[PDB]
Amino acid sequence: GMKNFRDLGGNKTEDGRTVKKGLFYRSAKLSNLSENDIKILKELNIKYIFDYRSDEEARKHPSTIISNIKNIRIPAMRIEDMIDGLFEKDGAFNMLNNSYYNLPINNPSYKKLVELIRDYSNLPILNHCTAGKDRTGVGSAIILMILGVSRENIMKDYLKSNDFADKEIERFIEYKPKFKDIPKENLKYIFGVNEEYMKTAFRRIDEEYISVEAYLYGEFNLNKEEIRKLRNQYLE
């Protein structure tokens, strides 16, 4: 089917409301969808699929076409080798952390995503990258910030990608049995997500802005009254 897929609805906000279901979805890539997968997405009435991937990723893994669903792609970024040097100075843990540091500020992809979600007529939307975990992690976190979800609850939704990671780790060990005794928690830094990555994205926000509200105003021109309006539309 479709991997790492979930509705952001049901998350609690700091003001006591809950995000409405059926408006914001996130997933991993949408290539080689079955006709049943297409039926699911059509029955959810999704209007836009928002793709964070690079030109090369989209060329190698084109999304399946769905009648009546419009696709918008804007790149949000500018295995054996990763495993060996995983924790070294220039290794994959440090490099992925650095990617998260660079994601939330001056991002043309997230700016377009926020522009889309500012109008109810554009919803429902689905946002995805390749694994649905890093670029979609920060983009979905931004949606949740706009909606008023706490950092603790943003982190919980972010870490849900580790269920997909567990399946990806098993798939990888089938491909390369020589790594069957690498600690699974170590492979999760590559195939999954970790609190430090999202904390690095938060830290960039906090270094640049005194509050999440200031960040949303500075990066997306979302003033307080506009945030109030969106919350009244999208929360129950």
Q: Provide the minimum distance between the beta carbon of 23 and Cl ion in the complex, in angstroms, as a whole number.
A: 21
Q: Provide the minimum distance between the beta carbon of 157 and Cl ion in the complex, in angstroms, as a whole number.
A: 13
Contact present, 203 and 101 (Cβ < 8 Å): yes
Stretch that binds Cl ion, among 8-16, 37-45, 99-107, 202-210 (CB under 5 A): 99-107
Where do we find the tokens 């195939």? Answer: 191
Out of 25, 93, 100, 164, the residue judged to bind Cl ion by CB under 5 A: 164
Out of 65, 178, 181, 225, the residue judged to bind Cl ion by CB under 5 A: 178
Rounded Cα gap, residues 203 and 223, in angstroms: 22
Stretch that binds Cl ion, among 36-44, 52-60, 94-102, 191-199 (CB under 5 A): 191-199
Rounded Cα gap, residues 107 and 86, in angstroms: 27
Q: Please identify, using beta-carbon distances, which residue of 152 and 225 lies nearer to Cl ion.
A: 152
Identity (one letter) of the amino acid at 119? D
Q: Please identify, using beta-carbon distances, which residue of 131 and 235 lies nearer to Cl ion.
A: 131
Q: Please identify, using beta-carbon distances, which residue of 123 and 222 lies nearer to Cl ion.
A: 222
Count of CB atoms within 10 A of residue 98's CB? Answer: 12
Residues in the chain: 236
Contact present, 219 and 104 (Cβ < 8 Å): yes
> What spatial distance separates the first Cα and last Cα of the chain, rounded to whole Å?
30
Out of 39, 61, 70, 176, the residue judged to bind Cl ion by CB under 5 A: 176
Q: Please identify, using beta-carbon distances, which residue of 13 and 162 lies nearer to Cl ion.
A: 162
Out of 34, 106, 221, 233, the residue judged to bind Cl ion by CB under 5 A: 106
- Say whether residue 112 binds Cl ion (CB under 5 A): no
Q: Provide the minimum distance between the beta carbon of 73 and Cl ion in the complex, in angstroms, as a whole number.
A: 20
Rounded Cα gap, residues 227 and 129, in angstroms: 26
Query: What is the sign of the dihedral through the CA atoms of 206, 208, 210 and 213?
Result: negative
Out of 170, 195, 196, 206, the residue judged to bind Cl ion by CB under 5 A: 195
Out of 3, 12, 160, 188, the residue judged to bind Cl ion by CB under 5 A: 3
Among residue numbers 197 through 226, which ones bind Cl ion (CB under 5 A)? 219
- Say whether residue 32 binds Cl ion (CB under 5 A): no
Q: Provide the minimum distance between the beta carbon of 217 and Cl ion in the complex, in angstroms, as a whole number.
A: 11
Contact present, 103 and 205 (Cβ < 8 Å): no
Q: Please identify, using beta-carbon distances, which residue of 56 and 207 lies nearer to Cl ion.
A: 207
Helix, strand, coil distribution of the chain in percent, nearest 5: 55, 10, 35
Contact present, 28 and 129 (Cβ < 8 Å): yes
Q: Name the residues that contact Cl ion, by CB under 5 A.
A: 3-4, 106, 164, 176-178, 195, 219
